[PDB]
Symmetry: C2
């Protein structure tokens, strides 16, 4: 059988979306979790000296969004058409920009900008997903962040009811909900 | 016929890889180059308040790399298999990281950053006999890398010293007839 190994740290972080894509797919994988200590001397073994790295039948693929997208396309969670896939990619790029800009003072104004943009996509889509009529990897990516932020800073969601509903919808999807219940509890 | 409009500033910048995909595909498109002054009233109309934005038959798609990957898949420049396309993606994302890292700046940030990044790029080149980064055919990440390398080497001749394979790649890509033609004919801009 095809063999998937995902190497990351012992935390959600940049490895989590890939993990949730596997969960959605009901796909078995090897979940390898490194500590800072054991990672650092292994750096040269990875394509760009960083984690996460996926191995598919032993072949390495690095970079979190490249890994998520690859797995999503493999399992059917990257949109229905090429333009849908591209729209999902654009939202995921917008996310990475928003993360970079934070970088109370920084978290609030970053999120009103980003969540305003997200909300536009949600309101024009009757399905409840960000793009098209089916769950995608960017839904996972965004819902997980929003849950995380709302967990740490409860007023994160205030003023964004469509975004709240989306977070709840995605995180209650049976295979995601299960994964969230069963995954290792980590500070990040 | 399918109608493509690319909106960006009057420069290479974040719009150029898309322009070069179009060139490579011999696809006509509307190349809209805004001034800051005409951009201001248009900002609210873009998906994330920024450019570049592509319209395909009037439907907007924002974000540089999303645009390039889309165009590249449309036209056949995103690898031969799903895994190739993911490797290409991984290189473009490594590029992005490198750009984040990078006279005084030359020596303090540029050259260190480029040693690390060009080392990674060189490893990909030297394991592939074709002369491309991934697979046996040109892809959009070849375009993105070669353009950056050309640009930096224009600014800082020593950029390419130590990286002959990267230079060779830059020249191969930029002499590809449709790309050469575009480079010869594009507006000359400071960025």
């Amino acid at each position: 059988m095809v063999h998937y190994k995902l190497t990351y740290f012992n935390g959600r972080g940049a490895g989590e979306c890939a993990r949730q894509v596997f969960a959605l797919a009901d796909q078995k994988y090897e979940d390898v979790r490194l500590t800072q200590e054991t990672f650092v001397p292994l750096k040269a073994t990875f394509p760009f000296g960083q984690v996460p790295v996926l191995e598919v039948d032993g072949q390495q693929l690095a970079q979190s969004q490249a890994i998520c997208r690859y797995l999503a396309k493999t399992f059917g969670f990257a949109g229905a058409t090429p333009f849908e896939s591209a729209l999902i990619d654009s939202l995921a790029d917008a996310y990475t920009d928003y993360r970079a800009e934070m970088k109370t003072d920084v978290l609030l104004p970053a999120r009103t900008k980003f969540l305003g943009f997200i909300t536009k996509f949600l309101k024009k889509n009757s399905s409840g997903f960000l793009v098209g009529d089916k769950i995608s990897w960017v839904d996972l990516l965004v819902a997980e962040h929003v849950a995380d932020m709302t967990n740490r800073v409860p007023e994160y969601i205030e003023g964004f009811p469509e975004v709240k509903a989306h977070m709840e919808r995605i995180q209650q999807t049976p295979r995601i909900k299960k994964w969230i219940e069963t995954r290792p509890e980590t500070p990040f």
